Amino acid sequence: MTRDQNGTWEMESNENFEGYMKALDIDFATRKIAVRLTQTKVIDQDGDNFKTKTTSTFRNYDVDFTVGVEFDEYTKSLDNRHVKALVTWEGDVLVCVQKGEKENRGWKQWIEGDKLYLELTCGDQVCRQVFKKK
Numbered sequence: 341m342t343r344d345q346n347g348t349w350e351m352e353s354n355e356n357f358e359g360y361m362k363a364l365d366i367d368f369a370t371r372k373i374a375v376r377l378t379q380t381k382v383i384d385q386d387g388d389n390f391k392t393k394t395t396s397t398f399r400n401y402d403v404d405f406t407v408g409v410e411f412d413e414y415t416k417s418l419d420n421r422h423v424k425a426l427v428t429w430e431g432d433v434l435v436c437v438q439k440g441e442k443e444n445r446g447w448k449q450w451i452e453g454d455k456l457y458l459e460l461t462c463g464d465q466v467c468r469q470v471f472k473k474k
């Protein structure tokens with residue numbers, strides 16, 4: 341029973357964020373700033389209802405969803421695309437498919453120990469993020 345992801349989470353590693361951003365066609369200037377940044381993620385979770393706020397000094401991004409309920413997602417101030425998103429549970433791993441113009445786009449997020457893991461995929465690029473609880 342490790343589905344409880346509530347908390348404030350501070351990034352400690354960010355593997356291949358550059359490649360993931362390039363796969364989303366983020367321009368070089370934006371990538372140059374973004375790749376440097378420590379992200380903080382606040383998760384407010386009530387059962388299958390999630391509200392997430394991811395912040396940095398450069399961009400912030402909020403996304404809310406209910407597991408199992410498809411929603412329209414506009415990735416405002418990231419790559420600024422519209423997708424149809426669905427989050428499901430696979431065991432205790434939160435799995436999101438973002439269907440749209442980029443093939444194989446999604447993410448997976450789960451707890452292991454006292455860390456939160458987030459793997460973001462676009463095409464053949466995977467970014468692996470690890471967060472420690474504050």
Ligand SMILES: CCCCC/C=C\C/C=C\C/C=C\C/C=C\CCCC(=O)SC[C@H](O)CO
Pocket residue numbers: 361364366370374377379381383392394395396398399400401402403417418419447449458460
């Ligand atoms: C917001 C901080 C970005 C700094 C880089 C700025 C510009 C780079 C521009 C584009 C890079 C694309 C995405 C950013 C990656 C992760 C952000 C979070 C996305 C989520 O919601 S993932 C699910 C959530 O974890 C659920 O709980």
